[PDB]
């Protein structure tokens, strides 16, 4: 629900945080467009593993210290087409433990 906003042509910011079991004990994260599906992300835009980011493109990057578990996302230069629900998924290990965050971007 909580609308996140940006004007066309701005960078957008979407917050997503998780807590590492311990510093430099990282958990796979993914952002996609569309709400979180059953597994991982729909239309991945960015994917990390335990070590680092392993998938991305130019428009999407992690703007923060993801090694401390700030996996908030920036989107380069938004068009109206970038409007919608973005999934941020923390693939916490163990049974059915995923943390799923849907964040609604709205582009004036």
């Amino acid at each position, epitope marked *: 629900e909580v609308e996140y906003r940006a004007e066309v042509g701005q960078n957008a910011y979407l917050p997503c945080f998780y807590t590492p079991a311990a510093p430099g004990n990282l958990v*796979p994260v993914c952002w996609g467009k569309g709400a979180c*599906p*059953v*597994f991982e*992300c*729909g239309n991945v835009v960015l994917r990390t*593993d*335990e070590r680092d980011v392993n998938y991305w493109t130019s428009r999407y990057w992690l703007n923060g210290d993801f090694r401390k578990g700030d996996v908030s996302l920036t989107i380069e230069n938004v068009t109206l087409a970038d409007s919608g629900i973005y999934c941020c998924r923390i*693939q916490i*290990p163990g049974i059915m433990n995923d943390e799923k965050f849907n964040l609604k971007l709205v582009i004036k």
Partner: antibody, heavy 123, light 108 residues
Framework: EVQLLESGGGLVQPGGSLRLSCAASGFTFSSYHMSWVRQAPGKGLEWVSAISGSGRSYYYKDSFFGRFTISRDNSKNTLYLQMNSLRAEDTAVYYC????????????????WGRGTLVTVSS | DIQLTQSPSFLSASVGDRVTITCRTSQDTNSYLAWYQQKPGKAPKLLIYAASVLLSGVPSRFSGSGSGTEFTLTISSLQPEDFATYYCQQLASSPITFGQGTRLEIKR
């Protein structure tokens, strides 16, 4: 050729245990969600279990809570299901499956299946 | 669990026919639906996923549409080899669930 080859299927008494294996070839195993999906003879498709690429995240349908454990050995390119407390109605063909072509849009859409291995729960 | 109800359960149709199979979901499933085609003694073959997207290899005479709670698989120009039980599958919420299946036999 992306290939999944289950084995371990066979006859097992109710209450009994069975480990299924799935051998994966022809792709980078350790970067793909793996699922088990099952099908009683003549009947429909039931998703059982999934596991993350890394093999540290596990997923289950409620019916398998506590009974079934999914694991992978990425170095052996092999997927496992440990099935405990098996029941007659667990009698089915067990497929492993992955999202390969699909992964970049919708994981869990299974473009790649195995042959199936039949598990029979009977006295 | 999200229930998927397919209709019809059974369909008999002549080569060249246009046939649609509907799948209704008990909750909003977004676009997170897949269509599979299972021939006897074989594993399901994925035809369509994300509602509308054809797997490479799949004849363009297969098509999907819909979103939310109602989804359609359409086979135009039905062929004999299109005999199969067809399943929808939702990928919106755990557990993954399928429809009961639609069996399509070829009138002849």
């Amino acid at each position: 050729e992306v290939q999944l080859l289950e084995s371990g299927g066979g006859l097992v008494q109710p209450g009994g245990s069975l480990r299924l294996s799935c051998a994966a070839s022809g792709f980078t195993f350790s970067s793909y969600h793996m699922s088990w999906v099952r099908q009683a003879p003549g009947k429909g498709l039931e998703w059982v279990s999934a596991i993350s690429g890394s093999g540290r995240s596990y997923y289950y349908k409620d019916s398998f809570f506590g009974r079934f454990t999914i694991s992978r050995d990425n170095s052996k390119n092999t997927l496992y299901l440990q099935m405990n407390s098996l029941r007659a109605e667990d009698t089915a063909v067990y497929y492993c499956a992955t999202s390969w072509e699909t992964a970049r849009i919708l994981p869990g859409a299974f473009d790649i299946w195995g042959r199936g291995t039949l598990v029979t729960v009977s006295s | 669990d999200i229930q998927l109800t397919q209709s019809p359960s059974f369909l008999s149709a002549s080569v060249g026919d246009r046939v649609t199979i509907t799948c209704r979901t008990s909750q909003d499933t977004n676009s997170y639906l897949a269509w599979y085609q299972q021939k006897p003694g074989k594993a399901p073959k994925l035809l369509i996923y994300a509602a509308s997207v054809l797997l490479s290899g799949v004849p363009s005479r297969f098509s999907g549409s819909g979103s939310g709670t109602e989804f359609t698989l359409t086979i135009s120009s039905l062929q004999p080899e299109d005999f199969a039980t067809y399943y929808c599958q939702q990928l919106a919420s755990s557990p993954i669930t399928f429809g009961q299946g639609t069996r399509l036999e070829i009138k002849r």
